[model samples]
Target: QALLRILKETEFKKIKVLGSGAFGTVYKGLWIPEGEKVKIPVAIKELRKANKEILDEAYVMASVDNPHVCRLLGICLTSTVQLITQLMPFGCLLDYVREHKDNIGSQYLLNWCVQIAKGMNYLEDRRLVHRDLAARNVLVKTPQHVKITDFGLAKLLKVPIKWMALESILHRIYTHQSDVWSYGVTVWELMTFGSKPYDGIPASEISSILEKGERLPQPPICTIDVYMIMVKCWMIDADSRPKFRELIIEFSKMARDPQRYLVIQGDERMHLPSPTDSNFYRALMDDDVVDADEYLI
Candidate 1:
């Protein structure tokens, strides 16, 4: 099979460690192409080891042609295989939210949410499953653009407990709908300024909690309309979940009237996780699948 020729190792000069995850370590680097006048800034993902499955991921990502998704620039075959792509200057969405959440308003945050939904919808139209969808997997660029990245462990990989949907955790389904479920969680994280889903709950306990008809409680700042969209995403039946395209439409509407949806609840009344949110009840009960070691998706 034909693949891009590996760029010489000397071509990449690693500047600093950008991020590390279960998949690999990414670095901010200076890329000097042969005969290129302007040096390019890139993020180089250095795999722990080169394997067929992982190498296939490089090819798949390279073939992707999209604006809202990460663009694979090329590859390097130094001591190990390295996949290269554009470096998002603003870094990952999770970190951004953590640093700026106090200052950013709900309407300003919706700008990022809508962009993420647009990127995922583009993948859905192409019949691709991101498998791993979370704020940590999204990257941000200048002028407030978000692109979905970390696609190496995508589709049929070992499931992450908290991010999974009911049918996905039970039947091993890896459809776009499952991605929508993860997107809802991402939305929750966005609204909460990077709060972990199911905080302080163990993976073993979450399923039982869900089976008892519990869902993730809405964030205090969550607006009624946005919370409803999130509830729709957590439906027990896969078909009941909105398609990525539908999410795109809903997010766009929210973006258009963001202030109307920024109601902040000050009362500290604790409500049980909604019945509609109890969709992920079987993930912990199912013992047929092999448990995967935790890694960044």
Candidate 2:
């Protein structure tokens, strides 16, 4: 009860529950609306009893003032801390790709990678590595922007040496290069519209295989340049991975001269839906799960 009191002290007015994570549950919270009439939406992450991990996440995110990073508006403390954030669906990238089609034309693909690279660059500049970089981590505002949200798997490894590069599966390193490696996986997620990464391979095998010269296969219709770029991120040598500068530059080039890139034929017939991306597919779909018999009764 004491915990609840501390969190409720904040100005947020809870309207309904949003969702929950391992450590907390989200609520459809209301904040002071601008223009003296509108009630803006916000998401509240109620930390399960205060702890160092949750507190550190808040600290790390608060330090980043980038629009592409998740914004931490404020934190509420009852017995625990209820972190306040700009309430937006973490559905931007995944939904966008799925809604249009499982696989889209290069135009949209370019847009996705550019936005992701921009956000990644923001983290890289801050010397942070989004250890678990994935399509689901990104929150879309529209066609152009999405906040990279989850910081649970993020790290602040200062140098390339700190990264546990040798352990490929349950990697011991959480460095910029690893983040870049994840970026490649994210690319796969976007192109496949939400296919699981490292699917066919065993987790144990990933470590040995990646430690060697092996690279994951690119999907159908995914461009060769993008494939080559992703492969670069997974180079056995951590130093060989292109820093965000190189990635951003390459993304720019792809945007400018997309015609020079590979044009493998993607499955254009079966369109993928936004409500099926593994990230939040169930969450988005649950919005419609109701008592269907209510009408019949």
Q: Compared with the true structure, what per-residue lDDT tens digits does model 2 show for residues 67-175?
A: 6677566666556567666666445566566665534566567666877788788888887767667776677754445668765433321212211244434556567
* Deviation of model 2 at 184, angstroms: 1.3
Candidate number achieving the greatest TM-score relative to the actual structure: 1
lDDT of each: 0.71, 0.61
* Superposition TM-score, candidate 2 onto the true structure: 0.72
Write one digit per residue (lDDT tens) for candidate 1, span 39-63: 5667788866345665566677766
Tell me each candidate's TM-score.
0.81, 0.72
- Global local distance difference test of model 2: 0.61
Model 2 spans > 4 angstroms off? 1-10, 14-23, 32-38, 48-57, 89-92, 152-171, 200-204, 262-297
Which stretches of model 1 miss by more than 4 angstroms? 1-5, 49-56, 155-159, 264-297
